[PDB]
């Protein structure tokens, strides 16, 4: 909702409450999953060509008792945009690989989980410096590219570490050395085609015997396709990764091949059914694991839109992973899940 | 002039037919949208299959073919090499061998191939395969006998790169020596060379379908695999050198007589059993009602028992010329019906899960061959003298 | 001693040549950097191709080969089996059949193969293929006639796993029975078995290139596909069982005479047209200037018309022995030039988009065979008596 | 009746054996967990290999086979076609040709194939291959001589789609004409057609292993590649048309005599060297101690020198019937030991990096054939009269 628009400054205050419940034989995901998100997007006109902006988004879980608080910052960044040249922003933001993979992250509840948060340059993460050029100086409609740098996020401070520390340090599964990446997308009418590449130094804390997938750098290569017209949405992405994909709590995959596909239709009366397939196939994993499925599921669901502010959905994760030693060791969910959600948003 | 296989091919082709199957199956419901960068993990769906077959009885219009072609068929069409078209009905099938029998409805002037004696085959022997590789028609390819198994699957280099496992394997005299198959199940397509069931086995399996309704192959009703499987490890099995029992089948002889998942069979009638494989093949050299005592392993357990007809080879909507999954029961002790479905067209007719049918709508139905022999002669009044153990009702 | 194909191969090899093509093409400009985890979506680029060919006229040095090898050639070299090297020039090509003709420049002591009569081929007949599979040289492989189409593409198992569609298909007498082709266009490489154009068709298409400059095949000038395409759905087509017209070609007879995208042809001269396929093949059994009335479907539309030479088979820098895309126009009504380019070496010479050339630099040029017959005899003074409809200019 | 290859195959099969190798190798230590969406980038690991071989000396129990099968073997087993089992030991191997020799331990009643004269082969000639394609056993496939190289690798279409490069290539008389190989090193498996070493070369390489311990092939000891490599560009090489020297091997003749990475050899004994390929093959037509003067390029450098035995073909734990990597040194100037290992079982016996052995535990050991000829006759007392240049010690 735009709550302020005066003398060239605009402020949009937005959010949602998702009354949400999971049904699953897996009791670690089963039960109340209610949550809310809040955010703001602000923009200020500096000149006719130059605009400054900032965005912040926060998630607060609504499913805990009052003696605890489970909340986090999704994004927080400030930036400058110049008409027909580009933009730059810095902060917690999305990695440029997400420019392509976001195209299949459109499912009612699940999806978008061949990668995670704080996972090199694949999704949300800290310390992104992002440069973007839209429409190639305004001379090629629909063509966009981006180049991104990520600074090191290392070991926690004040915990007796003698190397690799940063002020905002964290556990090794969520660390990263310096990284660089890029994306190109082209959209003509309904069609879209895109590609992205990322390369991040891996830290010493990540390259210990306690984690599978030791390596100097984490690399990702992504291609994507999209069709979005005539009430039909189709998209697919394929990603090859090296020492970049987490294998639950075990560490990372030496190599992984990720694939996601989605098909959706929008009825006039407000119903939007969705069908999707995701898989992540790991190779040469180490410790005798050899080749294993990290993720494999079919997602069938539907959303009903009452209007732009109220909707309800059901999403059914038909989980094709089988319960074995590998998935047990990594703590990967192999059970089906049904989600039922009712969402108010502004 | 120059040598050619065309002269014998002209005496052979009239026996090779083309087969077009139309049928449906249960597929999962697609979940949308589709995300190709997201590796995940009921409705009938029509499909079309096509394959070759060989006329084996000109009078009865009996055509032998692969079970991977006619399986799940609703409609099976046949086209002779001269172009005449006919309809066909299932008479038998056996997924193990991947061999099936069909019958042309209303045959007129047909030619049957002569079957040669598989047992006289030798490796340097010349071979010729005939099939429909990519749908585009009837292709013949030549070669020799590569390996004579010694089950005696025949191995031959007269195959086809990337094509579907055709059908007839014929010698230089135009006689049938084997039916080419597909060992890449629920696929069709080869490993690099060709595998055929030998003509003598084809003759044998085929007659059974005719004179009984199905092939007399008893199953031990266990299901399981090797000692490498994730479950053999996830359950840590002591002394690994045998067949791992993942589960004992319901209402089975293994179940009835005694056995439970985990035990690893070590022998069968005194002889060592080092792999499910060895076992699956050994139990396949024993017709129903046979008795085979095997040694199990838990701490040191062993038993003796008698097996019944397998469940893989069964019948469906072809017993009653009408339309609607029975199979044979023990010796000539009627025809026992199995797992009924959801549409329930046959259950709706008073037929439960274990209903035998010794009454041929009036007479003796020791088997599906006989039963079907009656539901084809007198299609007027039908009263199925079924007795599922106790209840001896007479439905229409 | 022992049988061998070496004795006839020695009488055949001198007719098989190797072919090295050098040429360029237009490729898109690479966008950098390169991100292999980002599935996206003008400059000449040199490429090299290599294939086999067969000497078909020893005196004229006429070699038959695949169009997928010489297409876009700038330089075409030929090496005999004895090792002598020569240069060659394009004389003809026809992308449909994937067959092309070339001429060795300055032949000396050549041997030509004898062509056998394709029509006498039968399936069990023996076959031998000769080609250059992986570049490493001239490989011969043997087999038999697998399928005789019945266009009569010949099917044979004398192919090669993963290799490029070679060239000559010869019978046991060393006579040419077909030229092996590639049905995996703009690729080369096979589907699993071999496809050859029959020798009789090769003879026929080949003579046309000689005596006319190109093959007389008329096009209906429509372009489109089946009724499954995204456009047949995205545009919802009523009554689907025919050829979908995606577009009517410019300056075409379909265009001229009347027709517009959408209509689905249902028949051609009374006969049913159930697929673009059926149609594309039927229009290929009709030489230029022919008249074929077909039924369209919009609500119920139908017309009659006469087609002109196709645009696929055309000429370029080989008409004028010099260097620089014409083709024939109707019957012997001169040589009509088509789409000029950007470098404009020939446009620069006063030749527009629709300029005929009935004047053989002085004489009659009813066709490219004749025209080229003059730009080869008198390379001294050249004045092209061209008349693009009205303007009758005389450029040098 | 009908023709068949079975009659000669019965006279051939007793000479073809199966081979089961068991051995280990060094693999990298797996890093966990495993992330399949993360393209990355010491412990012995047992592996099993299996292949075919041909009995070439019935008395000595000499079997020829591929080096890609027995390489790194710890245990090599052989099973005759009649089913008798034996043990075998390495006697020789040569990675270039991918050919190896072994000896059945304790032969009894063996049959050896007759070797035919490779030089009399011609392209249309008939061919038959015998091998163990997928492990399932001994498969024979037939065909013809496709290409006669002219090193004379034989090319034949008697191969196998997706299978491992078998072994024997035999003519219609049952005589050995070539041993089938794998040109897809450290893989096994074919490119689409078959490549065999000719029987005459097999005879020649094989005798060397017997009468010397290894094959007399001298190496120039340089290592490098073409002028396209990233290093030829990343280092910008002037005048590119030759072999790029990426590195000069240590303790080599190229090293000793003079040469340094970068120089691009342009000739060898006056003749042009346009590719590493050309060179690698030319240096392979020269036995040890030979002298070959070649022209290098830096600004214009050229030298002359004499090469020594290559390091690819070497011995290990088969010289001393006991168990524990030597090779021959120059002419009959003893047996020079090379790079010792970490387990150090042989270094532990007083054997350094460059220790010759002219003393046959008492006598003359001009070579490994002789040396091994003694460590097999008198396995009682052993004192190795080794002298690594100066030190002339006598260890046990």
UniProtKB/Swiss-Prot annotation, chain A:
Keyword Plastid applies: no
Membrane-topology descriptor: Multi-pass membrane protein
Periplasmic side: 1-12, 43-52, 81-85, 134-142, 187-190, 228-231, 266-270, 306-309, 346
Protein keywords: Cell outer membrane, Ion transport, Magnesium, Membrane, Metal-binding, Porin, Signal, Stress response, Transmembrane, Transmembrane beta strand, Transport
Extracellular topological domain: 22-32, 64-70, 95-120, 151-179, 199-220, 240-248, 279-297, 318-337
Recorded domain comment: Loop L3 (residues 116-133) extends along the inner side of the beta barrel wall and may constrict the pore mid-length.
Family in the record: Belongs to the Gram-negative porin family.
Subunit structure: Homotrimer. Forms mixed heterotrimers with OmpF and with PhoE; other mixed heterotrimers are also probable.
Record's protein name: Outer membrane porin C
Naturally occurring in which organism (per UniProt): Escherichia coli (strain K12)
Gene that encodes the chain: ompC
From Swiss-Prot, chains B, C, D:
Gene Ontology CC: one annotated term: outer membrane-bounded periplasmic space
Domain of life: Bacteria
Location of the PDZ domain: 209-300, 306-390
Listed GO MF terms: identical protein binding; peptidase activity; serine-type endopeptidase activity; serine-type peptidase activity
Temperature and activity: Optimum temperature is around 55 degrees Celsius. In the range from 37 to 55 degrees Celsius, the proteolytic activity rapidly increases with temperature.
Reported impact of residue 165 to A: Loss of peptidase activity with no detectable changes in secondary structure
Regulation: Inhibited by diisopropylfluorophosphate (DFP).
SUPFAM superfamilies found in the cross-reference section: PDZ domain-like, Trypsin-like serine proteases
Alphabetical GO biological process terms: chaperone-mediated protein folding; protein folding; protein quality control for misfolded or incompletely synthesized proteins; proteolysis; response to heat; response to oxidative stress; response to temperature stimulus
Active site: 68, 98, 165
Reported impact of residue 68 to R: Loss of peptidase activity with no detectable changes in secondary structure
The EC number(s) this enzyme carries: 3.4.21.107
Substitution effect: residue 184 to N: Loss of proteolytic activity
SMART domains: PDZ (SM00228)
Catalysed transformations (reactions): Acts on substrates that are at least partially unfolded. The cleavage site P1 residue is normally between a pair of hydrophobic residues, such as Val-|-Val
Observed effect of gene inactivation: Decreased induction of Cpx two-component regulatory system. Increased accumulation of periplasmic accessory protein CpxP, increased accumulation and toxicity of overexpressed, misfolded periplasmic proteins. Increased resistance to hydroxyurea, probably due to decreased degradation of misfolded proteins which eventually leads to decreased OH radical formation.
Entry membrane topology: Peripheral membrane protein
Keyword line: Cell inner membrane, Cell membrane, Disulfide bond, Hydrolase, Membrane, Protease, Repeat, Serine protease, Signal, Stress response
Induction note: By heat shock. Transcriptionally up-regulated by sigma-E factor and the Cpx two-component signal transduction pathway.
UniProt-annotated binding residues for substrate: 22, 68, 98, 163-165, 181-185, 220-224
Family assignment from sequence similarity: Belongs to the peptidase S1C family.
Other known facts: DegP is indispensable for bacterial survival at temperatures above 42 degrees Celsius, however is also able to digest its natural substrates in a reducing environment at temperatures as low as 20 degrees Celsius.
Function recorded in the entry: DegP acts as a chaperone at low temperatures but switches to a peptidase (heat shock protein) at higher temperatures. Degrades transiently denatured and unfolded or misfolded proteins which accumulate in the periplasm following heat shock or other stress conditions. DegP is efficient with Val-Xaa and Ile-Xaa peptide bonds, suggesting a preference for beta-branched side chain amino acids. Only unfolded proteins devoid of disulfide bonds appear capable of being cleaved, thereby preventing non-specific proteolysis of folded proteins.
Gene of this entry: degP
């Amino acid at each position: 909702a735009e709550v302020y628009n005066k003398d060239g400054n605009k402020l949009d205050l937005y959010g949602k409450v998702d009354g949400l419940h999971y049904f699953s034989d897996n009791k670690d995901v089963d039960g109340d999953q209610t949550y809310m998100r809040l955010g703001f997007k602000g923009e200020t006109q500096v000149t006719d060509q130059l605009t400054g902006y900032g965005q912040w988004e926060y998630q607060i879980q609504g499913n805990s008792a009052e003696n605890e608080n489970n909340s986090w910052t999704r994004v927080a960044f400030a930036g400058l945009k110049f008409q027909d040249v580009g933009s730059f922003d810095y902060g917690r933001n999305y990695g440029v690989v997400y420019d392509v993979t976001s195209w299949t992250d459109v499912l009612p509840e699940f999806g978008g989980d061949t990668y995670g948060s704080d996972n090199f340059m694949q999704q949300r993460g800290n310390g992104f410096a992002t440069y973007r050029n839209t429409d190639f100086f305004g001379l090629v409609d629909g063509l966009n590219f981006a180049v991104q740098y990520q600074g090191k996020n290392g070991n926690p401070s004040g915990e007796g570490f003698t190397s690799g520390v940063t002020n905002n340090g964290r556990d090794a599964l969520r660390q990263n050395g310096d990284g660089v990446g890029g994306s190109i997308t082209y959209d003509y009418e309904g069609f879209g085609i895109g590609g992205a590449i990322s390369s991040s130094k891996r830290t010493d804390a990540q390259n210990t015997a306690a984690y599978i997938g030791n390596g100097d750098r984490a690399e990702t290569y992504t291609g994507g396709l999209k069709y979005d017209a005539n009430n039909i949405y189709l998209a697919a992405q394929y990603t090859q990764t090296y020492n970049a994909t987490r294998v639950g709590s075990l560490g990372w995959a030496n190599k992984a091949q990720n694939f996601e596909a989605v098909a959706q239709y929008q009825f006039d009366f407000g119903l939007r059914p969705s069908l999707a397939y995701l898989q992540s196939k790991g190779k040469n994993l180490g410790r005798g694991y050899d080749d294993e499925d990290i993720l494999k599921y079919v997602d069938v669901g539907a959303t009903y839109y009452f209007n732009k502010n109220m909707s309800t959905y059901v999403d059914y994760k038909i989980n094709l992973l089988d319960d074995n030693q590998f998935t047990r060791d990594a703590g990967i969910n192999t059970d089906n899940i049904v989600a039922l959600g009712l969402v108010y948003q502004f | 002039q120059m040598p050619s296989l065309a002269p014998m091919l002209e005496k052979v082709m009239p026996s090779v037919v083309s087969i077009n199957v139309e049928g449906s199956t249960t597929v999962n419901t697609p979940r949308m949208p589709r995300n190709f960068q997201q590796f995940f993990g009921g409705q009938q769906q029509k499909f079309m299959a096509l394959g070759s077959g060989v006329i084996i009885d000109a009078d009865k219009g009996y055509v032998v073919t692969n079970n991977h072609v006619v399986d799940n068929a609703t409609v099976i069409k046949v086209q002779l090499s001269d172009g005449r078209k006919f309809d066909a009905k299932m008479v038998g099938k056996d997924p193990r061998s991947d061999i099936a029998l069909i019958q042309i409805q209303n045959p007129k002037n047909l030619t049957a191939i002569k079957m040669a004696d598989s047992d006289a085959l030798r490796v340097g022997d010349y071979t010729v395969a005939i099939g429909n590789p990519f749908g585009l028609g009837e292709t013949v390819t030549s070669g020799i006998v590569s390996a004579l198994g010694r089950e005696n699957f025949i191995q031959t280099d007269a195959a086809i790169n990337r094509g579907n496992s055709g059908g007839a394997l014929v010698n230089l005299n135009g006689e049938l020596i084997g039916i080419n198959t597909a060992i890449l199940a629920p696929d069709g397509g080869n490993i690099g060379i060709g595998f055929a069931i030998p003509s003598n086995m084809v003759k044998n399996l085929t007659s059974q379908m005719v004179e009984y309704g199905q092939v007399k192959r008893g199953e031990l009703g266990i299901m399981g695999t090797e000692l490498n499987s994730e479950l053999a490890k996830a359950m840590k099995v002591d002394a690994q050198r045998g067949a791992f029992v993942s589960q004992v089948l319901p209402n089975s002889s293994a179940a009835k007589a005694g056995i439970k998942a985990g035990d690893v069979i070590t022998s069968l009638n005194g002889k060592p059993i080092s792999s499910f494989a060895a076992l699956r093949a050994q139990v396949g050299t024993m017709p129903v009602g046979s008795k085979l005592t095997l040694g199990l392993l838990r701490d040191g357990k062993q038993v003796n028992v008698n097996l019944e007809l397998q469940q893989s080879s069964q019948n469906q909507v072809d017993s009653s010329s009408i339309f609607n999954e029975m199979s044979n029961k023990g010796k000539d002790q009627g025809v026992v019906v199995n797992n009924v479905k959801t549409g329930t067209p046959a259950a709706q007719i008073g037929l439960k899960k274990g209903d035998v049918i010794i009454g041929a709508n009036q007479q003796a139905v020791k088997n599906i061959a006989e039963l079907r022999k009656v539901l084809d002669s007198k299609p007027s009044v039908l009263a199925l003298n079924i007795q599922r153990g106790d209840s001896t009702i007479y439905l229409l």
